[PDB]
């Protein structure tokens, strides 16, 4: 027979516990606001019962009422002390229960008066569990209140250990409390960092390559039409050029431009740059001189490895080292002493720019080794395999063709320029020589599925939305996904049946992929969001673009992990595979090229007769997006004149397929161009 102080924050004042206490003729005072020592109520309180109160009482108040302040906290203390106990008890998968304990100096650390276990079914939502636990602890309080008042119960100190969480710890998970226990723990596995001690990377690529050369020295390494070089021959010739290159001042993180057609000299030059210590800057010779001079200027590359056929195209801007000049090779054929760390730059490839000119993507040796070290065991690549070096060597799809197969002892086959686009002769060569594994761009892959091939066992594809699955061959089709920034690819799917949306697969080694909403919070399984990549595949950033590195390579505020903002939208499927749901941004992947349609606008608008331009992507029935360039000009400009105009500054793949002349552009109510209202032919 006294007075009771009920201190709560979220709970309702019409609770069963409150009504029960008043039924025992106890006058109860409900108070949610902060109480201080000078409060007029503190002198008339006989008992203080708190129940998930959102604040701590001043140490003066807690000591004055020592031995008479109790808290009903619905967790199995010491597990899940403090905030959001039920959620953390489920996420961390700790034992579950409710505990009525004394309040001591710290948060939910006092001795336990009463403790009871509870169980949650898999189908219950986190709200159901929260409610079920709240009901169980209230009934526990109703049965044991008489024992608590009379002090009959013997409090016992908490076990040593436990965890602790604060209010902000849940910000990252605010959108998650609406999911079944099964679905929640399913997301936890898909977003669980691998167990502490995960295999790191200590070696550089050429360290592993030379090791593999000494394992299969007389095995065919590279094949170019009739000629071919073995691993021993390739390793020695590259070492000769590397000694000469190193002797000319090539240092770690230095850039060495390479401008050559696909050939044996290319592979020799590529490895020579690595062994020398620097990173190679591939420059497709089909680029216009404007583009070539730009890459040479922006990149801090003084050395340009090229031939005499294309030497003049550089206009003496760089100290040229002709790959045909015999004095470019030293007598020394031994492997050079390794001077590179896995954190050093291995190459700098150029992709399209977001707002303006393109940015050199810096890829490290720890981003290529991780990819090759996963590729070889997963696909079971062996020296018996012969791989096609098909993709243009300025795109990282060529790094897949070349580097992953060399570490596996396989043989590289440079695709002859004549048979490159005549897939009939390519398939003929592949059936004759026995080409077993190769990566083919989506365009070439679909065309190859029609052939009656029987030699290949693994064809890897990717880069564009695959739609055709039917093929007469017995080879496993593999669909891969990943941006250049995250090293070649990050996910892999084994295609087995038709799908309305062929998934891109599961993450590769040491790669976590997070689906986050606009607020960067985790998305529940089945909820769309931005695909965030975490792990060893992350690059060093963009060359000479630190502002974009900070924007795209962010350190998560709650998690603290370094992640790359891809700008891509994706979702986790229930089975773990990822579904690609397009991209927020202006970009679009057209036949293997990441382009900014707006990055053509300055060149185009710079034309005297051109006032405004907007390049959109339109698909004709079969879903394949192509670019139409609408422009407002007085008179229509000849199609070929614009293609040559863009050809002076842009590569062929950045030249829109169609250009449409218009007298004026349609506008929205807000003044924006009404992109929806533009025609198409």
Ligand X SMILES: *P(=O)(O)OCC(C)(C)[C@@H](O)C(=O)NCCC(=O)NCCS[C@@H](CS(=O)(=O)NC[C@H]1O[C@@H](n2cnc3c(N)ncnc32)[C@H](O)[C@@H]1O)[C@H](N)C(C)C
CA 661/CA 511 separation, integer angstroms: 46
Residue 96's contacts (CB-CB under 8 Å, 6 or more residues apart) are 75, 76, 89, 90, 117, 118, 119, 120, 133
Rounded to a whole number of angstroms, the minimum distance from the CB of residue 464 to ligand X is 5
Query: What value does the CA radius of gyration of the chain take, rounded to a whole number of Å?
Result: 33
Instruction: Note whether 480 binds ligand X by CB under 6 A.
Output: yes
How far apart are alpha carbons 391 and 402 in whole angstroms? 10
* Residue 321 or 578 with smaller CB distance to ligand X: 578
Cβ at position 267, least distance to ligand X in Å:
17
Among 530, 568, 599, 649, binds ligand X (CB under 6 A): 568
Whichever of 219 and 565 has its CB closer to ligand X, that residue is 565
Report the alpha-carbon angle 446-447-453, nearest 5: 100
Site string for ligand X, 456-475 (x = CB under 6 A): ------xxxxx---------
CA 567 → CA 132, 504, 530, 570, 581, distances in Å?
A: 40, 16, 7, 10, 11
Nearer residue to ligand X within complex by CB, 219 or 591: 591
For the chain, percent helix, then strand, then coil, each to nearest 5? Answer: 30, 25, 45
State yes or no: residue 481 binds ligand X (CB under 6 A): yes
**Is the Cα torsion angle 21, 22, 28, 30 positive or negative in sign?**
positive
Reference 165, options 99, 246, 108; nearest CA is 108
State the DSSP code for 180. B
Q: Segment near ligand X (CB under 6 A), from 303-311, 391-399, 451-459, 662-670?
A: 391-399
Q: Which 275-304 residues touch ligand X, going by CB under 6 A?
A: none
Please, what is the minimum distance in Å from the beta carbon of residue 533 to ligand X? 10
CA distance 226 to 217: 20
Q: How far is the CB of 363 from ligand X (least distance, A)?
A: 11
Tokens linked to 320: 């040229």
* Residue 108 contacts ligand X per CB under 6 A: no
Among 21, 52, 126, 489, binds ligand X (CB under 6 A): 489
Whether the ω angle into residue 436 lies within 30 degrees of 0, i.e. cis, is no
580 part of the interface to ligand X, by CB under 6 A:
yes
Shortest CB 399 distance to ligand X, Å: 8
**With binding defined as CB under 6 A, does residue 597 bind ligand X?**
no
Where in 612-671 is the site for ligand X (CB under 6 A)?
A: 652-653
DSSP for 7-18?
A: E-SSS-TT-HHH
DSSP 80: T
Residue labelled with tokens 């340009």: 304
Nearer to ligand X, 18 or 578 (CB): 578
- Please name the helix (run of DSSP H) or strand (run of DSSP E) that holds residue 204, with its range, or none: none
CA distance 637 to 642: 7
Q: Which of 248, 313, 556, 589 binds ligand X (CB under 6 A)?
A: 589
CA–CA separation, 557 vs 570, rounded Å?
22
Q: Considering the rule CB under 6 A, would residue 487 count as an interface residue with ligand X?
A: no
Closer to ligand X by CB, 96 or 510: give it: 510
Could you give the string, one character per residue 411-450, with x where binding to ligand X holds by CB under 6 A and - elsewhere? ------------------------------x-xx------
Shortest separation between residue 361's beta carbon and ligand X, angstroms: 8
Q: Does 351 bind ligand X (CB under 6 A)?
A: yes
- Number of residues in contact with ligand X, rule: CB under 6 A? 33
136 binds ligand X (CB under 6 A): no
* Site of interaction with ligand X (CB under 6 A): 351, 391-392, 395-397, 441, 443-444, 462-466, 479-484, 488-489, 504, 566, 568, 580, 589, 591-594, 652-653
């Amino acid at each position: 027979m006294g007075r009771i102080l009920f201190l709560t924050t979220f709970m309702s004042k019409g609770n069963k516990v409150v009504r029960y206490l008043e039924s025992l003729h106890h006058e109860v005072v409900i108070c949610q606001e902060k109480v201080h020592a000078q409060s007029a109520n503190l002198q008339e309180i006989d008992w203080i019962v708190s129940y998930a109160y959102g604040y701590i009482l001043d140490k003066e108040i807690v000591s004055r009422f020592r031995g008479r302040i109790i808290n009903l906290h619905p967790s199995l203390l010491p597990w899940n002390k403090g905030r959001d106990p039920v959620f953390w008890s489920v996420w961390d998968e700790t034992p579950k229960g409710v505990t009525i304990h004394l309040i001591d100096e710290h948060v939910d650390t006092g001795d336990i008066l009463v403790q009871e276990e509870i169980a949650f079914a898999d189908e219950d939502t986190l709200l159901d569990c929260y409610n079920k636990a709240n009901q169980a602890i209230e009934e526990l309080f109703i049965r044991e209140w008489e024992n608590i008042v009379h002090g009959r119960i013997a409090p016992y100190r908490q076990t040593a250990g436990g965890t602790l969480h604060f209010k902000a710890d849940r910000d990252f998970y605010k959108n998650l409390n609406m999911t079944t226990v099964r679905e929640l723990l399913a997301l936890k596995r898909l977003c669980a960092e691998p167990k502490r001690g995960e295999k790191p990377i200590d070696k550089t690529f050429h360290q592993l390559f030379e090791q593999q050369v000494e394992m299969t020295p007389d095995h065919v390494a590279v094949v170019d039409r009739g000629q071919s070089l073995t691993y021993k021959q390739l390793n020695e010739r590259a070492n000769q050029l590397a000694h000469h290159l190193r002797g000319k001042g090539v240092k770690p993180d230095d850039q060495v431009a390479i401008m050559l057609d696909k050939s044996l000299d290319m592979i020799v030059s590529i490895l020579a740059v690595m062994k020398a210590g620097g990173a190679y800057v591939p420059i497709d010779p089909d680029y216009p001189g404007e583009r070539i001079a730009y890459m040479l200027a922006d990149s801090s590359a003084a050395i340009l490895l090229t031939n005499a056929l294309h030497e003049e195209k550089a206009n003496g801007a760089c100290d040229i080292i002709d790959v045909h000049d015999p004095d470019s090779y030293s007598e020394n054929t031994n492997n050079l002493p390794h001077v590179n760390r896995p954190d050093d730059l291995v190459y700098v490839m150029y992709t399209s720019g977001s707002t303006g000119l393109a940015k050199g993507v810096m890829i490290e040796h720890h981003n290529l080794v991780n990819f090759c070290e996963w590729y070889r065991p997963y696909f079971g690549v062996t020296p018996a395999d012969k791989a096609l070096v098909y993709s243009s060597f300025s795109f990282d799809g060529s790094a897949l063709d070349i580097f992953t197969h060399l570490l596996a002892g396989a043989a590289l086959h440079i695709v002859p320029s004549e048979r490159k686009y005549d897939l009939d002769a390519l398939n003929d060569y592949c059936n004759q020589e026995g080409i077993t594994i190769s990566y083919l761009p989506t365009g070439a892959a679909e065309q190859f599925m029609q052939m009656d091939n029987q030699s290949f066992r693994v064809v890897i594809t990717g880069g564009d939305v695959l739609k055709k699955i039917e093929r007469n061959g017995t080879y496993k089709l593999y669909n891969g996904y990943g941006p250049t920034e995250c090293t070649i690819m990050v996910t892999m799917f084994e295609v087995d049946k038709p799908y309305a949306n062929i998934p891109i697969g599961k993450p590769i080694d040491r790669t976590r992929i997070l689906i986050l909403d606009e607020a960067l919070a985790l998305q529940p399984i089945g909820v769309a969001g931005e695909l965030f990549i975490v792990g060893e595949g992350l690059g060093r950033g963009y060359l000479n673009r630190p502002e974009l590195t900070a924007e795209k390579f962010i350190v998560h505020p709650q998690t603290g992990e370094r992640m790359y903002r891809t700008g891509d939208r994706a979702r986790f499927l229930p089975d773990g595979n990822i579904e690609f749901l397009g991209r927020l941004d202006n970009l679009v992947k057209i036949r293997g090229y990441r382009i900014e349609p707006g990055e053509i606008e300055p060149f185009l608008m710079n034309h005297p007769l051109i006032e405004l331009t907007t390049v959109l992507a339109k698909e004709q029935a079969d879903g394949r997006k192509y670019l139409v360039g609408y422009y407002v000009a007085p008179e229509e400009i000849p199609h070929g004149e614009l293609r040559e105009w863009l050809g002076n500054d842009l590569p062929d793949y950045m030249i829109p397929t169609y250009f449409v002349h218009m007298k004026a552009f349609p506008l929205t109510a807000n003044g924006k161009v009404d992109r929806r209202a533009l025609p198409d032919v």
